[PDB]
Design a binder for these strands. Structure first.
Ligand SMILES: [K+]
Ligand SMILES: [K+]
Ligand SMILES: [Mg+2]
Ligand SMILES: [Mg+2]
Length: 135
RNA sequence: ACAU
DNA sequence: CGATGT
């Protein structure tokens, strides 16, 4: 029903899918950019959405923040819940970097705890997520 | 179908 | 129009 304004919103941006992937996290209320990942040469939209949520979890935990995270990605929200990114992207030399980051994000989830609620941003009711790249 |  | 996902 109501946006929880005291939250962190994340989104992926890409050039191609698969293609160059980046992501960022913003303060939902103000749009202040809180983190931005350097572009990764080849990845998928869903791998980027997953990495963005996990990075948000790590960012909030490090800062002792209980804020929830918004993502618009049904897929990535489930992958985080499962602690398993079920990506179809081939593993080869050009995808090694993204797969290393995904593997490491899963490993972090399997070795840390968090209470952070991971919430679906209701794009149909609220418009684009505040972290959107607008592309 | 839904979410990107 | 194409692709990534449940
Ligand atoms: K966009
Ligand atoms: K589809
Ligand atoms: Mg998104
Ligand atoms: Mg977006």
């Amino acid at each position: 029903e109501e946006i929880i304004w005291e939250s962190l919103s994340v989104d992926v941006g890409s050039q191609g899918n698969p293609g160059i992937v980046e992501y960022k996290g913003v303060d939902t209320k103000t749009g202040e950019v809180l983190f931005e990942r350097e572009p990764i040469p080849i990845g998928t939209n869903n791998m980027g959405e997953f990495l963005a949520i996990v990075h948000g979890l790590r960012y909030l935990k490090e800062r002792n923040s209980r804020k929830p995270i918004y993502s618009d990605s049904q897929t990535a929200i489930k992958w985080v819940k499962d602690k398993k990114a079920k990506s179809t992207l081939v593993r080869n030399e050009e995808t090694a970097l993204i797969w290393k980051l995904v593997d490491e994000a899963e490993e972090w989830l399997n070795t840390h705890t968090y209470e952070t609620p991971i919430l679906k941003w209701q794009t149909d009711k609220w418009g684009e997520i505040k972290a959107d790249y607008g592309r």
